[PDB]
């Protein structure tokens, strides 16, 4: 089995707010 | 207009059903609009057709990590959020 | 270079386990401080000794979904940042 | 078997927490 990897961390913050 | 949006990132499973959770994920975000609900819905529909065990993950801003038998793995961001899917076995 | 409070809010597994994860986790992050790694290097070393396969997710802002064997699950908040972890067989 | 269910609060950033 292969071994999932992933690091989210995106700034759309914009005019709203994440 | 838009169909069959998200992008690709992790592709790694048969078209129909990278498709599927693609737009089965759309779905999800038109009637719930909620990273949580997302993976619930998409999660039980395929464990339900496709037999489980599907994990999935949405949001904004997280580290993760898993594992999972080759061509069962799948990855894509959409409407402003990432969204992850795939099945164990 | 050990002790960390960490608190629980879905215990579901031995307690040495969770434990044996959150001081874990503290390690992790004066080791890599870093949401990814930390899931990496934890999952490996719990598959190894308790064997696979344990999920792990760790960041601030994120919704998910997960199947898991009973007795495998267990969440808690720690260094400013939720820590999961979570195996299956 | 039991199928996990969370939805993560901006602990520390701009503002600060």
């Known amino acids: 089995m292969k071994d999932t990897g992933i690091q ?11 | 207009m838009c169909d069959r949006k998200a992008v690709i990132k992790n592709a790694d499973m048969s078209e129909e059903m990278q498709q599927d ?10 009637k719930y609009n909620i990273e949580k609900d997302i993976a619930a819905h998409i999660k039980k529909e395929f464990d339900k057709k496709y037999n489980p065990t599907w994990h999935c993950i949405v949001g904004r801003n997280f ?5 999972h038998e080759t061509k069962h793995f799948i990855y894509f961001y959409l409407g402003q959020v990432a969204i992850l ?3 164990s076995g």
């Open chain 1, 8 to 18: 989210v961390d995106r700034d759309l913050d914009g005019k709203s707010h994440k």
């Open chain 2, 21 to 30: 959770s693609v737009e089965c994920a759309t779905q999800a975000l038109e």
């Open chain 2, 63 to 67: 580290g993760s990590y898993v594992t």
């Open chain 2, 85 to 87: 899917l795939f099945k």
